[PDB]
PDB file of C-alpha atoms in Angstrom:
ATOM      1  CA  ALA A   1      82.977  10.962  41.011  1.00 30.77           C
ATOM      2  CA  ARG A   2      85.399   7.738  39.942  1.00 33.15           C
ATOM      3  CA  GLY A   3      87.955  10.445  41.824  1.00 35.55           C
ATOM      4  CA  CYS A   4      89.223   8.917  45.595  1.00 36.78           C
ATOM      5  CA  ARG A   5      85.769   9.300  47.781  1.00 38.88           C
ATOM      6  CA  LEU A   6      84.004   8.507  50.516  1.00 38.39           C
ATOM      7  CA  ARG A   7      81.656   6.164  50.218  1.00 32.96           C
ATOM      8  CA  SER A   8      78.921   4.629  51.633  1.00 32.45           C
ATOM      9  CA  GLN A   9      75.801   2.414  51.535  1.00 32.72           C
ATOM     10  CA  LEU A  10      73.171   0.992  53.758  1.00 33.27           C
ATOM     11  CA  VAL A  11      73.287  -3.117  54.365  1.00 34.02           C
ATOM     12  CA  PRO A  12      72.323  -5.828  56.116  1.00 35.18           C
ATOM     13  CA  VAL A  13      75.234  -7.192  59.060  1.00 35.51           C
ATOM     14  CA  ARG A  14      74.409 -10.344  57.556  1.00 38.66           C
ATOM     15  CA  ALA A  15      76.084 -10.011  54.334  1.00 39.80           C
ATOM     16  CA  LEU A  16      79.395  -8.159  56.521  1.00 41.56           C
ATOM     17  CA  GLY A  17      80.474 -11.334  56.932  1.00 40.80           C
ATOM     18  CA  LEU A  18      81.133 -11.152  60.908  1.00 40.59           C
ATOM     19  CA  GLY A  19      78.578 -14.863  61.598  1.00 41.94           C
ATOM     20  CA  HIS A  20      75.504 -13.020  62.047  1.00 38.63           C
ATOM     21  CA  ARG A  21      72.639 -13.657  60.614  1.00 38.15           C
ATOM     22  CA  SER A  22      70.405 -10.083  61.678  1.00 38.20           C
ATOM     23  CA  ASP A  23      68.920  -8.564  58.345  1.00 40.92           C
ATOM     24  CA  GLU A  24      68.949  -5.301  60.606  1.00 39.60           C
ATOM     25  CA  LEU A  25      70.399  -2.274  57.056  1.00 37.51           C
ATOM     26  CA  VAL A  26      73.775  -0.415  58.864  1.00 38.21           C
ATOM     27  CA  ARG A  27      75.213   2.411  57.026  1.00 38.98           C
ATOM     28  CA  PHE A  28      78.831   0.464  56.178  1.00 41.19           C
ATOM     29  CA  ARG A  29      81.290   2.623  54.063  1.00 42.12           C
ATOM     30  CA  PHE A  30      85.094   2.003  52.572  1.00 41.96           C
ATOM     31  CA  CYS A  31      86.783   3.802  50.244  1.00 42.82           C
ATOM     32  CA  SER A  32      86.769   4.101  46.264  1.00 47.31           C
ATOM     33  CA  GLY A  33      88.622   5.676  43.759  1.00 48.50           C
ATOM     34  CA  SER A  34      91.828   6.941  41.743  1.00 49.90           C
ATOM     35  CA  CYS A  35      94.294   8.251  42.983  1.00 49.12           C
ATOM     36  CA  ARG A  36      96.336   9.686  40.202  1.00 50.74           C
ATOM     37  CA  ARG A  37      96.982  13.221  41.334  1.00 47.89           C
ATOM     38  CA  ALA A  38      98.763  12.218  44.229  1.00 49.60           C
ATOM     39  CA  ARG A  39     101.015   9.626  41.485  1.00 48.70           C
ATOM     40  CA  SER A  40     104.889  10.066  41.902  1.00 48.43           C
ATOM     41  CA  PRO A  41     108.338  10.199  40.020  1.00 43.40           C
ATOM     42  CA  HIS A  42     108.853   6.183  40.580  1.00 44.52           C
ATOM     43  CA  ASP A  43     104.062   5.758  39.657  1.00 44.28           C
ATOM     44  CA  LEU A  44     104.435   7.932  36.466  1.00 44.09           C
ATOM     45  CA  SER A  45     107.260   5.784  35.300  1.00 46.11           C
ATOM     46  CA  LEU A  46     105.646   2.899  36.005  1.00 46.86           C
ATOM     47  CA  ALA A  47     102.282   3.904  33.880  1.00 45.69           C
ATOM     48  CA  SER A  48     104.425   4.758  31.474  1.00 47.07           C
ATOM     49  CA  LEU A  49     106.818   1.376  31.227  1.00 49.09           C
ATOM     50  CA  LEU A  50     103.086  -0.606  31.315  1.00 51.62           C
ATOM     51  CA  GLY A  51     101.456   1.125  28.654  1.00 51.77           C
ATOM     52  CA  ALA A  52     104.812   0.200  26.990  1.00 50.59           C
ATOM     53  CA  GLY A  53     104.810  -3.165  27.543  1.00 51.03           C
ATOM     54  CA  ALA A  54     108.179  -2.868  28.418  1.00 49.18           C
ATOM     55  CA  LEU A  55     108.062  -4.782  31.816  1.00 46.61           C
ATOM     56  CA  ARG A  56     107.825  -8.248  32.154  1.00 46.32           C
ATOM     57  CA  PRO A  57     104.771  -9.695  34.572  1.00 45.87           C
ATOM     58  CA  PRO A  58     105.627 -10.632  38.074  1.00 49.52           C
ATOM     59  CA  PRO A  59     104.587 -13.333  39.437  1.00 50.30           C
ATOM     60  CA  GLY A  60     100.735 -13.071  40.840  1.00 50.31           C
ATOM     61  CA  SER A  61      99.021  -9.715  41.108  1.00 47.54           C
ATOM     62  CA  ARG A  62      99.454  -6.601  38.209  1.00 49.68           C
ATOM     63  CA  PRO A  63     101.598  -3.285  39.721  1.00 51.00           C
ATOM     64  CA  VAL A  64      99.277  -0.729  40.444  1.00 53.61           C
ATOM     65  CA  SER A  65     100.780   2.764  39.384  1.00 54.33           C
ATOM     66  CA  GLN A  66      98.936   4.919  41.372  1.00 54.46           C
ATOM     67  CA  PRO A  67      98.785   4.861  45.288  1.00 55.33           C
ATOM     68  CA  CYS A  68      95.097   3.020  46.352  1.00 53.84           C
ATOM     69  CA  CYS A  69      92.093   4.988  47.833  1.00 53.22           C
ATOM     70  CA  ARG A  70      92.413   3.579  51.300  1.00 50.51           C
ATOM     71  CA  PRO A  71      90.798   5.036  55.006  1.00 49.93           C
ATOM     72  CA  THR A  72      92.288   7.246  56.889  1.00 50.35           C
ATOM     73  CA  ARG A  73      89.566   6.861  59.780  1.00 49.39           C
ATOM     74  CA  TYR A  74      87.698   3.943  61.273  1.00 55.32           C
ATOM     75  CA  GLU A  75      84.282   4.117  63.542  1.00 52.99           C
ATOM     76  CA  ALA A  76      82.810   1.146  65.278  1.00 53.14           C
ATOM     77  CA  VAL A  77      79.258  -0.773  63.571  1.00 51.49           C
ATOM     78  CA  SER A  78      77.446  -1.751  67.044  1.00 50.13           C
ATOM     79  CA  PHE A  79      73.161  -3.915  66.457  1.00 53.36           C
ATOM     80  CA  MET A  80      70.853  -5.756  68.338  1.00 52.94           C
ATOM     81  CA  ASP A  81      71.875  -9.493  67.532  1.00 53.61           C
ATOM     82  CA  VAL A  82      68.753 -11.958  67.971  1.00 53.59           C
ATOM     83  CA  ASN A  83      69.212 -12.188  71.489  1.00 55.47           C
ATOM     84  CA  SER A  84      68.694  -8.390  72.010  1.00 54.87           C
ATOM     85  CA  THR A  85      72.593  -8.260  72.788  1.00 52.52           C
ATOM     86  CA  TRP A  86      74.024  -4.931  70.958  1.00 55.69           C
ATOM     87  CA  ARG A  87      77.019  -6.151  69.573  1.00 53.46           C
ATOM     88  CA  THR A  88      80.499  -3.774  68.083  1.00 53.99           C
ATOM     89  CA  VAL A  89      82.988  -4.464  65.894  1.00 53.71           C
ATOM     90  CA  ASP A  90      85.583  -1.390  66.265  1.00 50.81           C
ATOM     91  CA  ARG A  91      86.976   0.280  63.577  1.00 48.64           C
ATOM     92  CA  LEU A  92      84.818  -1.556  61.163  1.00 46.36           C
ATOM     93  CA  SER A  93      83.540   1.178  58.752  1.00 44.69           C
ATOM     94  CA  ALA A  94      85.241   4.674  57.594  1.00 47.58           C
ATOM     95  CA  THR A  95      85.400   7.878  58.024  1.00 48.29           C
ATOM     96  CA  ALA A  96      87.511   9.324  55.679  1.00 51.43           C
ATOM     97  CA  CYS A  97      89.407   8.402  52.691  1.00 52.14           C
ATOM     98  CA  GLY A  98      92.923   9.181  51.071  1.00 53.08           C
ATOM     99  CA  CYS A  99      95.368   8.732  48.574  1.00 51.55           C
ATOM    100  CA  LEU A 100      97.857   6.365  50.361  1.00 53.71           C
ATOM    101  CA  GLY A 101     101.718   4.738  49.843  1.00 54.21           C
TER     102      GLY A 101
ATOM    103  CA  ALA B   1     106.861 -15.662  45.241  1.00 57.50           C
ATOM    104  CA  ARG B   2     103.057 -14.171  44.946  1.00 59.77           C
ATOM    105  CA  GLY B   3     103.202 -11.621  47.943  1.00 60.95           C
ATOM    106  CA  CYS B   4     103.743  -8.534  47.774  1.00 60.34           C
ATOM    107  CA  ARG B   5     107.355  -7.741  47.603  1.00 61.53           C
ATOM    108  CA  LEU B   6     110.524  -6.297  45.884  1.00 63.95           C
ATOM    109  CA  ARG B   7     110.677  -7.377  41.752  1.00 61.81           C
ATOM    110  CA  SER B   8     113.017  -6.024  39.853  1.00 64.49           C
ATOM    111  CA  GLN B   9     114.481  -6.097  35.919  1.00 69.61           C
ATOM    112  CA  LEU B  10     116.472  -3.553  33.454  1.00 67.27           C
ATOM    113  CA  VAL B  11     114.011  -1.765  31.019  1.00 65.30           C
ATOM    114  CA  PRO B  12     114.865   1.284  28.387  1.00 62.34           C
ATOM    115  CA  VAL B  13     114.891   5.021  29.511  1.00 60.18           C
ATOM    116  CA  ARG B  14     112.580   5.384  25.917  1.00 65.06           C
ATOM    117  CA  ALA B  15     109.227   3.799  28.096  1.00 64.46           C
ATOM    118  CA  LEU B  16     110.169   5.551  31.245  1.00 59.85           C
ATOM    119  CA  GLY B  17     108.065   8.382  30.029  1.00 57.28           C
ATOM    120  CA  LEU B  18     110.012  11.633  30.562  1.00 54.31           C
ATOM    121  CA  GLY B  19     110.617  12.695  27.368  1.00 52.96           C
ATOM    122  CA  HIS B  20     114.638  12.004  26.953  1.00 52.12           C
ATOM    123  CA  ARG B  21     115.814   9.175  24.578  1.00 50.74           C
ATOM    124  CA  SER B  22     118.874   8.230  26.135  1.00 50.31           C
ATOM    125  CA  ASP B  23     120.281   4.627  24.245  1.00 51.99           C
ATOM    126  CA  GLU B  24     121.411   2.564  27.545  1.00 54.69           C
ATOM    127  CA  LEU B  25     118.983   0.619  30.047  1.00 56.67           C
ATOM    128  CA  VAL B  26     118.511   1.132  33.081  1.00 55.63           C
ATOM    129  CA  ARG B  27     117.124  -0.462  36.130  1.00 57.98           C
ATOM    130  CA  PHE B  28     113.961   0.032  37.613  1.00 56.24           C
ATOM    131  CA  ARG B  29     112.826  -1.644  41.000  1.00 53.37           C
ATOM    132  CA  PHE B  30     109.147  -1.826  41.718  1.00 53.05           C
ATOM    133  CA  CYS B  31     106.522  -3.878  44.144  1.00 56.48           C
ATOM    134  CA  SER B  32     103.833  -6.163  43.357  1.00 56.55           C
ATOM    135  CA  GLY B  33     102.068  -8.961  44.811  1.00 53.46           C
ATOM    136  CA  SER B  34      98.807  -9.644  48.241  1.00 54.45           C
ATOM    137  CA  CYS B  35      98.983  -8.464  51.216  1.00 54.17           C
ATOM    138  CA  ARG B  36      95.663 -10.389  51.778  1.00 52.03           C
ATOM    139  CA  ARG B  37      97.257 -12.045  55.297  1.00 50.85           C
ATOM    140  CA  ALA B  38      97.154  -8.207  56.005  1.00 51.62           C
ATOM    141  CA  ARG B  39      93.567  -7.485  55.847  1.00 52.02           C
ATOM    142  CA  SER B  40      92.380  -5.475  58.862  1.00 51.17           C
ATOM    143  CA  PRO B  41      88.353  -6.476  59.593  1.00 50.02           C
ATOM    144  CA  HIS B  42      86.941  -3.533  57.527  1.00 47.71           C
ATOM    145  CA  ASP B  43      88.545  -5.562  54.085  1.00 46.28           C
ATOM    146  CA  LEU B  44      87.511  -8.725  54.982  1.00 43.44           C
ATOM    147  CA  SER B  45      84.224  -6.842  55.435  1.00 42.49           C
ATOM    148  CA  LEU B  46      83.908  -4.666  51.931  1.00 40.08           C
ATOM    149  CA  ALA B  47      86.169  -7.751  50.617  1.00 40.06           C
ATOM    150  CA  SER B  48      83.080  -9.730  52.444  1.00 41.03           C
ATOM    151  CA  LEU B  49      79.954  -7.710  50.547  1.00 37.99           C
ATOM    152  CA  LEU B  50      81.900  -7.892  46.810  1.00 39.66           C
ATOM    153  CA  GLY B  51      82.160 -11.756  46.812  1.00 40.95           C
ATOM    154  CA  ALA B  52      78.284 -11.583  47.750  1.00 42.31           C
ATOM    155  CA  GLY B  53      77.491  -8.113  44.974  1.00 42.37           C
ATOM    156  CA  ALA B  54      75.907  -6.627  48.228  1.00 40.93           C
ATOM    157  CA  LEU B  55      77.388  -3.413  46.764  1.00 39.72           C
ATOM    158  CA  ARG B  56      76.449  -1.121  43.912  1.00 41.04           C
ATOM    159  CA  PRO B  57      79.149  -0.347  42.179  1.00 41.64           C
ATOM    160  CA  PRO B  58      80.600   2.961  42.846  1.00 42.18           C
ATOM    161  CA  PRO B  59      81.559   5.113  39.230  1.00 42.83           C
ATOM    162  CA  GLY B  60      85.589   3.886  37.878  1.00 44.24           C
ATOM    163  CA  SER B  61      87.247   0.789  39.766  1.00 42.50           C
ATOM    164  CA  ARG B  62      86.122  -1.127  42.495  1.00 44.01           C
ATOM    165  CA  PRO B  63      87.703  -0.674  45.753  1.00 47.01           C
ATOM    166  CA  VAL B  64      90.771  -2.633  46.664  1.00 47.81           C
ATOM    167  CA  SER B  65      89.868  -4.679  49.681  1.00 45.47           C
ATOM    168  CA  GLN B  66      93.456  -5.963  51.843  1.00 45.32           C
ATOM    169  CA  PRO B  67      96.862  -3.093  51.319  1.00 46.59           C
ATOM    170  CA  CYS B  68      98.203  -2.241  48.081  1.00 45.15           C
ATOM    171  CA  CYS B  69     102.120  -3.287  47.485  1.00 43.31           C
ATOM    172  CA  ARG B  70     104.340  -0.260  47.829  1.00 43.11           C
ATOM    173  CA  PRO B  71     107.025   0.682  47.808  1.00 44.57           C
ATOM    174  CA  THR B  72     108.525   2.330  51.113  1.00 44.06           C
ATOM    175  CA  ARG B  73     110.990   2.787  50.082  1.00 41.56           C
ATOM    176  CA  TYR B  74     113.142   4.670  46.655  1.00 42.63           C
ATOM    177  CA  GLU B  75     116.771   5.588  45.177  1.00 46.49           C
ATOM    178  CA  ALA B  76     117.851   7.598  41.674  1.00 48.02           C
ATOM    179  CA  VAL B  77     118.108   6.767  38.227  1.00 46.02           C
ATOM    180  CA  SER B  78     120.543   8.533  36.037  1.00 50.23           C
ATOM    181  CA  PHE B  79     121.125   7.983  33.126  1.00 48.54           C
ATOM    182  CA  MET B  80     123.101   9.334  29.732  1.00 49.73           C
ATOM    183  CA  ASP B  81     120.534  11.109  27.012  1.00 50.42           C
ATOM    184  CA  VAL B  82     121.123  10.690  23.513  1.00 48.07           C
ATOM    185  CA  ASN B  83     123.799  13.861  23.465  1.00 51.21           C
ATOM    186  CA  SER B  84     125.146  13.156  26.113  1.00 49.95           C
ATOM    187  CA  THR B  85     124.367  14.359  29.411  1.00 49.13           C
ATOM    188  CA  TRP B  86     124.249  13.206  32.192  1.00 45.13           C
ATOM    189  CA  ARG B  87     119.515  12.839  33.658  1.00 44.17           C
ATOM    190  CA  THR B  88     118.619  12.168  37.047  1.00 41.62           C
ATOM    191  CA  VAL B  89     114.747  11.589  38.508  1.00 45.48           C
ATOM    192  CA  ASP B  90     115.373  11.086  42.518  1.00 44.17           C
ATOM    193  CA  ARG B  91     112.966   8.201  44.140  1.00 43.52           C
ATOM    194  CA  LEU B  92     113.013   7.006  40.922  1.00 43.24           C
ATOM    195  CA  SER B  93     113.554   2.855  41.769  1.00 40.28           C
ATOM    196  CA  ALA B  94     111.792   1.291  43.965  1.00 36.12           C
ATOM    197  CA  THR B  95     114.346  -0.293  47.116  1.00 34.66           C
ATOM    198  CA  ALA B  96     112.138  -2.001  49.858  1.00 31.67           C
ATOM    199  CA  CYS B  97     108.109  -2.772  49.819  1.00 30.58           C
ATOM    200  CA  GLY B  98     105.627  -3.141  52.177  1.00 28.83           C
ATOM    201  CA  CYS B  99     101.549  -4.329  52.770  1.00 25.12           C
ATOM    202  CA  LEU B 100      99.975  -0.649  52.819  1.00 24.32           C
ATOM    203  CA  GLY B 101      96.758  -0.526  53.429  1.00 20.92           C
TER     204      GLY B 101
END
């Protein structure tokens, strides 16, 4: 369950950051989880260096020592707005995940 | 400086987690930094949902909501071990970065 995989949850369209206020619930899918199984020699050494405190913190976010769990395919989310007009946002919801990079 | 880019530092071979203990340092390069401007519509909605606490937490790590800063190219690293034998690991060090999302 902690490993990289497709996740999903019903959420209101208004929470999607699309500028709409509809309370209609739509199933939003996304990717999250560990990708340690797909780590390369570079990744393992980076992980070891960080674990040993051998690396000085570069400016900004910490280096990721493994591929990131990201969508490999997407599908559109559609809904009716306040005027009963159909709206569609293409490729907004994930349909598959992978350990990329 | 906080944006995704190639980083570099001299590090002890012993800290690379290779099992081989050397005594010289090697130049190790990696990638780290932000990719916010590279967010896709999916990433933006995921970020909107996470920002509002609209998603229950999936087991393990939180989903990433922007491409990850990862290497796009690598190079070998070689070093002489404590018994005077040269060792090498292909593609151990990064030579270029990209916002892989």
